[PDB]
Amino acid sequence: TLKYPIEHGIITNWDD
Amino acid sequence: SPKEILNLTSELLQKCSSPAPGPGKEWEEYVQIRTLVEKIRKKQKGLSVTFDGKREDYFPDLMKWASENGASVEGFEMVNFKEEGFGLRATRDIKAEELFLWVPRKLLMTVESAKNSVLGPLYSQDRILQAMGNIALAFHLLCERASPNSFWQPYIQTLPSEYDTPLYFEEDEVRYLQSTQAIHDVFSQYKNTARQYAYFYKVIQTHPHANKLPLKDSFTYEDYRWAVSSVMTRQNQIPTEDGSRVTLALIPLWDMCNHTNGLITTGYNLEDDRCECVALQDFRAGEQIYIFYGTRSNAEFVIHSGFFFDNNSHDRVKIKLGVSKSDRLYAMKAEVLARAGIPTSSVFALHFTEPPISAQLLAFLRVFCMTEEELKEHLLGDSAIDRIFTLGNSEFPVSWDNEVKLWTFLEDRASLLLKTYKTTIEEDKSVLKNHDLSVRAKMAIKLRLGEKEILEKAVKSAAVNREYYRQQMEE
Numbered sequence: 089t090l091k092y093p094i095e096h097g098i099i100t101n102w103d104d
Numbered sequence: 105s106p107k108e109i110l111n112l113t114s115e116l117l118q119k120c121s122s123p124a125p126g127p128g129k130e131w132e133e134y135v136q137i138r139t140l141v142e143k144i145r146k147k148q149k150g151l152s153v154t155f156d157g158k159r160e161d162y163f164p165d166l167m168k169w170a171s172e173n174g175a176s177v178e179g180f181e182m183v184n185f186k187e188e189g190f191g192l193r194a195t196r197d198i199k200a201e202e203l204f205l206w207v208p209r210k211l212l213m214t215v216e217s218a219k220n221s222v223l224g225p226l227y228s229q230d231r232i233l234q235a236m237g238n239i240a241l242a243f244h245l246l247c248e249r250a251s252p253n254s255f256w257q258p259y260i261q262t263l264p265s266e267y268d269t270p271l272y273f274e275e276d277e278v279r280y281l282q283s284t285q286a287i288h289d290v291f292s293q294y295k296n297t298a299r300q301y302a303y304f305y306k307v308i309q310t311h312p313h314a315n316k317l318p319l320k321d322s323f324t325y326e327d328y329r330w331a332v333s334s335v336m337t338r339q340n341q342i343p344t345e346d347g348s349r350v351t352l353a354l355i356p357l358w359d360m361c362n363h364t365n366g367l368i369t370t371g372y373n374l375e376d377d378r379c380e381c382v383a384l385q386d387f388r389a390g391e392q393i394y395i396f397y398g399t400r401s402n403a404e405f406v407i408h409s410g411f412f413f414d415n416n417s418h419d420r421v422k423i424k425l426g427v428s429k430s431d432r433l434y435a436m437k438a439e440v441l442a443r444a445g446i447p448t449s450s451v452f453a454l455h456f457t458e459p460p461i462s463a464q465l466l467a468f469l470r471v472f473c474m475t476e477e478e479l480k481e482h483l484l485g486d487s488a489i490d491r492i493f494t495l496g497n498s499e500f501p502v503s504w505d506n507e508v509k510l511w512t513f514l515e516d517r518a519s520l521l522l523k524t525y526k527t528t529i530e531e532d533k534s535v536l537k538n539h540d541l542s543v544r545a546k547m548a549i550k551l552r553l554g555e556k557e558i559l560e561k562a563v564k565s566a567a568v569n570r571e572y573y574r575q576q577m578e579e
């Protein structure tokens with residue numbers, strides 16, 4: 089597979 | 105007057121800084137916040153910066169801008185599809201695994217490029233921008249959007265004007281999702297975004313290091329809702345220039361590809377310092393070019409990508425499970441689970457494509473239903489280690505009896521969860537057939553239908569396993 093897969097629209101935490 | 109807006113945003117930051125509303129008050133907390141937000145938005149003037157041209161009028165500017173900085177600009181064109189919106193269509197035949205798309209870092213918008221921007225001084229002087237790259241990326245978008253000679257102007261001028269994230273839904277559209285698992289992350293999204301807008305509006309208006317920012321007297325709720333939905337629907341994680349830590353980035357030109365089912369074919373190449381994408385399948389000329397976005401649930405597609413993907417083989421619902429500390433066998437089960445690298449209580453997933461449960465959940469259910477003898481055969485002896493290695497494997501059951509009791513457990517648990525929804529599966533298929541709904545409304549209803557169809561799949565799957573392994577006891 090890939091060394092650095094790029095996930096489009098990766099889920100991040102928005103809870104500041 | 106901006107003095108009236110500063111009053112209203114302080115009133116909003118308060119309502120969003122209380123704790124969680126409680127048990128059965130989360131729908132009305134959201135309606136109250138919605139009321140305050142809609143009042144503010146309707147006293148503001150939408151997006152603060154709009155463009156004279158139409159969206160497709162800036163795509164040659166984007167191509168020209170990407171070509172000059174080393175990106176691939178040949179083989180594809182921009183087409184406004186009804187279904188997916190804008191995307192890429194092949195102007196020539198493209199074979200599977202061919203490297204057709206590459207974008208060097210110089211074009212991307214990164215967290216660090218936001219630190220080197222006109223946003224810099226405020227960034228260094230604000231805890232929340234320092235802690236949250238995605239918000240920092242979002243303000244990067246707005247500051248370059250407000251900058252008339254910005255380097256990223258060809259990218260920003262080809263980004264959408266609005267989105268189908270829940271931040272754009274109407275009350276009645278979110279209302280379909282009541283009693284689902286999904287709606288709790290829609291409530292978090294609205295509250296969080298509303299809190300962040302009310303906080304940062306005050307910061308932009310009064311902080312000495314935001315004084316000569318272009319956002320100073322032009323930062324509407326719409327501006328922020330568009331910025332975070334822009335980031336949310338297409339942000340990426342890439343390595344740094346050297347390759348030690350990961351960072352968040354927006355990828356021009358390549359982020360214009362729409363999603364289909366498949367595998368990830370977009371990697372970063374540290375050596376030549378660029379994003380690289382190979383064709384996921386064969387694209388004839390005149391066919392749309394898709395990529396696989398990632399293994400994501402329909403709940404995550406709707407909330408964070410602003411669309412519902414119908415053929416989603418990675419769909420799932422959440423399920424809470426743990427050994428109750430009142431179990432007479434808590435200590436042995438907790439040590440077996442510890443030896444298997446499995447938490448005592450955890451949030452697991454029911455899946456759409458067989459098998460409904462992962463290797464980890466099956467191992468948990470197996471320990472969860474073991475007797476004292478079986479627990480000892482996994483804790484003591486020369487085979488104890490080898491016996492735990494196979495807990496997550498469907499071919500090495502502990503016993504017929506163990507399997508029967510855990511599929512009986514799973515069948516009842518999914519059946520119970522099914523009953524906690526306000527509409528049934530049959531009711532949802534009826535609403536889709538006989539009503540005429542917006543795109544956002546179809547999303548909400550297909551989402552709550554999907555949750556239930558996974559539960560129902562788990563019931564049937566657990567029932568056939570239960571009957572298969574009960575036939576084995578009789579022999």
Ligand SMILES: Nc1ncnc2c1ncn2[C@@H]1O[C@H](C[C@@H](N)CC[C@H](N)C(=O)O)[C@@H](O)[C@H]1O
Pocket residue numbers: 187188189190191263264268337338359360361362363364409410411412413
């Ligand atoms: N398979 C799909 N079905 C429907 N909408 C999609 C699909 N894939 C992507 N989208 C839309 O495209 C967005 C992701 C974008 N980065 C891709 C380009 C986008 N369509 C645009 O016109 O800007 C998502 O937020 C959705 O709005």
